[PDB]
């Protein structure tokens, strides 16, 4: 059964490695300005790098991470925002179109 994401964001930062890959992607992928959801150009390969760095993790991609949110109560505005950084992340989508 498909987890709820933030279920599963827990369980990825107990462990050191995948708190660490995980905190590069969301670092590497941000947008450049709250108005603006595309990270500057010159991130594109660094963004890249730091969502491929999720494989192998409990975050590992398919993309979105094995996880949903449902059953997120009242913290489901946030399970939202932490879903939608890998489904509607345009920093992320331009630098596969670029490097991947």
Known sequence: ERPNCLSLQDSCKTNYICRSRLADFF???????????????????????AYSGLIGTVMTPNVAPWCDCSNSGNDLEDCLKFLNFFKDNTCLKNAIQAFG
Do not use: F, I
């Open 27 to 49: 670092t590497n992928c941000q947008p450049e300005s709250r108005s603006v959801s595309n990270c500057l150009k010159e991130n594109y390969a660094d963004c890249l790098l």
